[PDB]
Symmetry: C4
Subunit: 159 residues, 4 copies
């Protein structure tokens, strides 16, 4: 069973902008760029919402890697423990997706947390999805395509 966020926040504009603000030394910038686009598009293909990439300033969905405290109330904590977090749609921090630089991330060719899967999960949150009780769902709390539960949920929110 999928979940949304309390009060069911969602992007209400036809177009939502996103920006990859900071990268990881674990991967080429372009790899992160392509994987983020692939993640967004997985959700995008199921709903009447369009994403537009911006390379500077503020965008609706701010995506990036950071070490320690980084401007919100959920500072990262070094290697292990918390790995990432994302915020439900809304202004400011809303929609943003942050990844802890102190972990090891991979595109699949090395050791590490698979970035595509993690990004697809985090971006699910950025769009308004909560965690699912269905182990098959990308939105399941713990850890390729969206499951029926993920699709049902996102379409229910957008629709």
């Amino acid at each position: 069973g999928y979940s949304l966020f309390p009060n069911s926040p969602k992007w209400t504009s036809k177009v939502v902008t996103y920006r990859i603000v900071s990268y990881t030394r674990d991967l080429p910038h372009i790899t992160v760029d392509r994987l983020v686009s692939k993640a967004l598009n997985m959700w995008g293909k199921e709903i009447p919402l369009h994403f537009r990439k911006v390379v500077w300033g503020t965008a609706d969905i701010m995506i990036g890697f950071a070490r320690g405290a980084h401007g919100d109330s959920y500072p990262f904590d070094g290697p292990g423990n918390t790995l990432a977090h994302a915020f439900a749609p809304g202004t400011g921090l809303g929609g943003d997706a942050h990844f802890d630089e102190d972990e090891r991330w991979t595109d699949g060719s090395s050791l590490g947390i698979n970035f595509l899967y993690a990004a697809t999960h985090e971006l699910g949150h950025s769009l308004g999805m909560g965690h699912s009780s269905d182990p098959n769902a990308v939105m399941y709390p713990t850890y390729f395509k969206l499951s029926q539960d993920d699709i049902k949920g996102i379409q229910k929110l957008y629709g």
Copy 2:
């Protein structure tokens, strides 16, 4: 309601020197230099105190970024937790402002703790300001211009 430090320490000389001793890889050195000057000047414009920049040795206000233990009794602790500290006016460590290198700092163009705001708060301490009970104040314990409370407080001390 603004606060000062116990015994209300303040710089008693007409001129107070400052030095940016160490920088962060998160930003250009010159950016940190300019933001520090801007922060000091925000307080400076309200009082009969003049700041003089020095680029070597000891200055009254020593400013810098550090990882872990760094020569005082308040070692930093890695990503998260403590982010920075500054000491009330006085000799030696007095007036110094230290920032934890293990966080992410920004000038506003990326993810991170906004350095200008953090520096303005920390330098407030370096000049003798304590924390305020007024949420509008730059000296409020948690997180652009100085509020009426900040101004009232600094002018009361100098003034």
Copy 3:
């Protein structure tokens, strides 16, 4: 007294592949390569099992250094505490040997955990050895050649 793993898992194929997926800045890549080969061969000479090195993709025994969370349920934790872990033979994570990048590793010419000894111990696990109660054994829980206990154990498992 040597130990194996519950249910005594072992590689059942004549040839087992291995790959050094990630390295440490503490040593040249080639040094890690040579020490891994030496470690494997120490066990290899005692049993009817052959190792084949691969330099890309997946291999049966995936070996590497990582910081923090890295794709399994045993994230590393920064300097100190956990130093490494390896998994009993089996598919997927089975057989893999991971080393925490946040420690200092050496080939013997500097300060650090001796990589050859650590790798020989970890690879013992990758082959199906558990910890020994014999302090002379390379498989003893705490810390050059395999002891009689190590040999007896690996030969008992292979066989």
Copy 4:
């Protein structure tokens, strides 16, 4: 009141060798080299013991910087907490002096723990000195020349 180590271990040879095995990115290698020599010589001038520098392999007194676990039973722990440790005279680890790379060290021109003072204290241990109860002593547990207590203690031991 100065202290020595239980059983009063000391170097019994006329010549004791030392090697700086690893350095810190905080300072030039040559700076660390010169400060170590200065520290040793401070103790050396008070006793009938001669120090000989070696640049490779093993020396009686192994000196270096390390992150996390590094080959002894006192792994470092990242920024803060433990900063350094040294072992009483003896074979193997005996006499060695280790410094945590995760702190900030300085030669006096920047922010950080003053390396000369820290090295003089640590090397005191490497020679057989324990902590002093005299706040004036370099061997006092918490923090330029050796005090009367330091001199009395080292001369009593040598001796």
